[PDB]
């Protein structure tokens, strides 16, 4: 439930101008929760698929590491609302979300 929580405080800026998004998502929507739908692939090239619920919209983004996974997810959320994330000119193809 909600009542009776420990509270995990983890923070690290190992990346470069990337975590920015992670902090943002929390800035606009404090008290968020990230979960790993599933992980596939090798041990050196694992795929950490994270997921988050924002504004009644569930976002899922996979990455090379859980750390990047959560970050990628946020970037999307913002992009959906129309907020600056730090990425462009990256056409996806003939298929869109």
From Swiss-Prot:
Involved in spermatogenesis and sperm function. Plays a role in regulation of cell growth. Binds to double-stranded DNA and RNA. Binds most efficiently to poly(I:C) RNA than to poly(dI:dC) DNA. Binds also to single-stranded poly(G) RNA. Binds non-specifically to the mRNA PRM1 3'-UTR and adenovirus VA RNA. Coiled coil: none annotated. It comes from Homo sapiens (Human). This is Spermatid perinuclear RNA-binding protein. It comes from the Eukaryota. Residues 17-83 form the DRBM domain. Disulfide bonds: none annotated. Interacts with EIF2AK2. Associates with microtubules; it is unsure whether such interaction is direct or indirect. It is found in: Cytoplasm. The gene is STRBP. The lineage of its organism: Eukaryota, Metazoa, Chordata, Craniata, Vertebrata.
């Amino acid at each position: 439930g909600s009542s009776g929580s420990s509270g995990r405080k983890i923070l690290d800026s190992k990346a470069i101008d990337l975590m920015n998004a992670l902090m943002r998502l929390n800035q606009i929507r404090p008290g968020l929760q990230y979960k790993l739908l599933s992980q596939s692939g090798p041990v050196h090239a694992p795929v950490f698929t994270m997921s988050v619920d924002v504004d009644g919209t569930t976002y899922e983004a996979s990455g090379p590491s859980k750390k990047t996974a959560k970050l990628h997810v946020a970037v999307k959320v913002l992009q959906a609302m129309g907020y600056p994330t730090g990425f462009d000119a990256d056409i996806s193809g003939p298929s869109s979300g």
